[PDB]
Ligand binder design. Structure first.
Ligand code: 28E
Ligand code: NA
Length: 156
Protein backbone atom coordinates (compact mmCIF):
# COMPACT_ATOMS: atom_id res chain seq x y z
CA UNK A 1 0.00 0.00 0.00
CA UNK A 2 0.97 3.60 -0.47
CA UNK A 3 0.97 5.92 2.52
CA UNK A 4 1.46 9.62 1.91
CA UNK A 5 2.56 12.29 4.42
CA UNK A 6 2.98 16.01 3.85
CA UNK A 7 4.87 18.52 5.98
CA UNK A 8 5.01 22.26 5.46
CA UNK A 9 8.35 23.98 6.09
CA UNK A 10 9.75 27.47 5.66
CA UNK A 11 12.98 29.09 4.46
CA UNK A 12 14.22 32.69 4.10
CA UNK A 13 15.68 31.78 0.69
CA UNK A 14 13.40 32.64 -2.28
CA UNK A 15 12.13 29.66 -4.25
CA UNK A 16 13.98 30.20 -7.54
CA UNK A 17 17.33 30.07 -5.69
CA UNK A 18 16.48 27.12 -3.55
CA UNK A 19 15.26 25.39 -6.66
CA UNK A 20 18.47 25.99 -8.63
CA UNK A 21 20.43 24.64 -5.63
CA UNK A 22 18.09 21.61 -5.39
CA UNK A 23 19.16 20.67 -8.90
CA UNK A 24 22.93 20.74 -7.75
CA UNK A 25 22.25 18.42 -4.87
CA UNK A 26 24.59 15.75 -6.19
CA UNK A 27 27.51 18.18 -5.82
CA UNK A 28 26.29 20.02 -2.68
CA UNK A 29 25.19 17.14 -0.41
CA UNK A 30 28.41 15.23 0.05
CA UNK A 31 30.12 18.48 1.12
CA UNK A 32 27.60 19.38 3.80
CA UNK A 33 26.17 16.00 5.00
CA UNK A 34 28.93 14.16 6.84
CA UNK A 35 27.65 10.67 6.27
CA UNK A 36 27.17 11.20 2.50
CA UNK A 37 30.42 10.54 0.69
CA UNK A 38 29.44 10.54 -3.01
CA UNK A 39 26.65 10.49 -5.54
CA UNK A 40 27.31 8.71 -8.85
CA UNK A 41 25.00 8.54 -11.78
CA UNK A 42 24.51 4.93 -12.85
CA UNK A 43 22.14 5.47 -15.78
CA UNK A 44 20.71 8.58 -17.36
CA UNK A 45 21.49 12.23 -17.93
CA UNK A 46 20.27 13.68 -14.66
CA UNK A 47 16.60 14.06 -15.62
CA UNK A 48 13.55 11.91 -14.74
CA UNK A 49 14.41 8.27 -14.83
CA UNK A 50 18.07 8.72 -13.90
CA UNK A 51 19.47 6.21 -11.46
CA UNK A 52 21.99 7.36 -8.90
CA UNK A 53 24.04 5.47 -6.38
CA UNK A 54 24.89 7.22 -3.06
CA UNK A 55 27.79 5.98 -1.08
CA UNK A 56 27.41 6.73 2.62
CA UNK A 57 29.08 5.83 5.94
CA UNK A 58 27.19 4.54 8.95
CA UNK A 59 29.08 3.15 12.00
CA UNK A 60 32.38 3.35 10.07
CA UNK A 61 30.86 1.01 7.49
CA UNK A 62 30.40 1.98 3.81
CA UNK A 63 26.83 1.45 2.58
CA UNK A 64 25.02 2.13 -0.73
CA UNK A 65 21.67 3.68 -1.52
CA UNK A 66 19.91 3.64 -4.88
CA UNK A 67 17.84 6.62 -6.02
CA UNK A 68 15.64 7.16 -9.00
CA UNK A 69 14.88 10.71 -10.20
CA UNK A 70 11.09 10.80 -10.65
CA UNK A 71 10.13 14.23 -11.96
CA UNK A 72 11.35 17.78 -12.04
CA UNK A 73 8.44 20.16 -12.48
CA UNK A 74 10.01 23.58 -12.87
CA UNK A 75 6.66 25.35 -13.18
CA UNK A 76 5.99 24.32 -9.61
CA UNK A 77 9.67 24.52 -8.41
CA UNK A 78 9.53 20.76 -7.71
CA UNK A 79 12.16 18.04 -7.43
CA UNK A 80 11.10 14.41 -6.83
CA UNK A 81 13.21 11.28 -6.19
CA UNK A 82 12.62 7.76 -4.81
CA UNK A 83 14.78 5.55 -2.60
CA UNK A 84 14.72 2.27 -4.56
CA UNK A 85 17.42 0.27 -2.89
CA UNK A 86 19.64 -0.03 0.12
CA UNK A 87 19.44 0.36 3.83
CA UNK A 88 17.73 3.75 3.54
CA UNK A 89 15.22 1.21 2.20
CA UNK A 90 13.70 -0.62 5.16
CA UNK A 91 13.40 -4.46 4.65
CA UNK A 92 9.52 -4.42 4.54
CA UNK A 93 9.19 -1.39 2.16
CA UNK A 94 9.06 -1.46 -1.71
CA UNK A 95 10.13 2.12 -2.15
CA UNK A 96 10.13 5.59 -0.59
CA UNK A 97 9.36 8.68 -2.53
CA UNK A 98 10.51 12.14 -1.44
CA UNK A 99 8.96 15.14 -3.07
CA UNK A 100 9.84 18.74 -2.48
CA UNK A 101 7.84 21.67 -3.85
CA UNK A 102 8.29 25.37 -3.27
CA UNK A 103 6.01 28.47 -3.43
CA UNK A 104 6.74 32.08 -2.52
CA UNK A 105 6.43 32.86 1.19
CA UNK A 106 5.35 36.16 2.93
CA UNK A 107 8.74 37.98 3.14
CA UNK A 108 10.73 37.01 0.01
CA UNK A 109 11.30 33.46 1.42
CA UNK A 110 9.71 30.16 0.51
CA UNK A 111 7.15 27.76 1.82
CA UNK A 112 8.16 24.19 1.21
CA UNK A 113 5.94 21.16 1.01
CA UNK A 114 7.79 17.95 1.69
CA UNK A 115 5.86 14.85 0.67
CA UNK A 116 6.88 11.33 1.77
CA UNK A 117 5.16 8.41 0.00
CA UNK A 118 5.96 5.17 1.70
CA UNK A 119 5.23 2.14 -0.59
CA UNK A 120 4.80 -1.08 1.40
CA UNK A 121 4.37 -4.68 0.20
CA UNK A 122 0.83 -6.00 0.17
CA UNK A 123 -1.16 -4.98 3.17
CA UNK A 124 1.75 -4.01 5.45
CA UNK A 125 1.86 -0.51 7.03
CA UNK A 126 4.90 1.70 7.45
CA UNK A 127 6.92 1.21 10.63
CA UNK A 128 6.65 4.35 12.77
CA UNK A 129 10.38 4.60 13.51
CA UNK A 130 11.09 4.24 9.73
CA UNK A 131 8.65 6.97 8.93
CA UNK A 132 10.27 9.26 11.55
CA UNK A 133 13.64 8.46 10.06
CA UNK A 134 12.49 9.14 6.52
CA UNK A 135 10.99 12.49 7.37
CA UNK A 136 14.18 13.51 9.16
CA UNK A 137 16.19 12.59 6.08
CA UNK A 138 13.95 14.54 3.72
CA UNK A 139 14.12 17.62 5.96
CA UNK A 140 17.85 17.14 6.35
CA UNK A 141 18.49 17.30 2.61
CA UNK A 142 16.35 20.38 2.34
CA UNK A 143 18.31 22.06 5.17
CA UNK A 144 21.61 21.05 3.50
CA UNK A 145 20.66 22.65 0.22
CA UNK A 146 19.31 25.68 2.06
CA UNK A 147 22.46 25.88 4.22
CA UNK A 148 24.68 25.86 1.18
CA UNK A 149 22.76 28.77 -0.35
CA UNK A 150 22.85 30.83 2.84
CA UNK A 151 26.57 30.16 3.22
CA UNK A 152 27.44 30.82 -0.46
CA UNK A 153 25.24 33.82 -1.35
CA UNK A 154 27.00 34.81 -4.61
CA UNK A 155 26.43 31.39 -6.27
CA UNK A 156 22.65 31.56 -6.67
O1 28E B 1 22.95 8.39 4.92
C1 28E B 1 22.16 9.42 4.49
C2 28E B 1 22.09 10.57 5.24
C3 28E B 1 21.31 11.63 4.83
O2 28E B 1 21.29 12.71 5.62
C4 28E B 1 20.60 11.59 3.65
C5 28E B 1 20.66 10.43 2.90
C6 28E B 1 21.45 9.35 3.31
O3 28E B 1 19.98 10.31 1.73
C7 28E B 1 19.15 11.39 1.21
C8 28E B 1 19.93 12.18 0.21
C9 28E B 1 21.28 12.46 0.32
C10 28E B 1 21.95 13.17 -0.67
C11 28E B 1 21.23 13.58 -1.81
O4 28E B 1 21.81 14.27 -2.80
C12 28E B 1 19.89 13.32 -1.93
O5 28E B 1 19.18 13.74 -3.02
C13 28E B 1 19.24 12.62 -0.93
C14 28E B 1 18.56 12.19 2.37
O6 28E B 1 17.59 13.14 1.86
C15 28E B 1 19.72 12.76 3.21
NA1 NA C 1 30.35 14.15 3.43
Amino acid sequence: GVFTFEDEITSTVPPAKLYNAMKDADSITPKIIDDVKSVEIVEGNGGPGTIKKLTIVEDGETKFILHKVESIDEANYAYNYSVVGGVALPPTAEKITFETKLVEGPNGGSIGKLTLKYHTKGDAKPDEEELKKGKAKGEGLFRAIEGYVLANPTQY
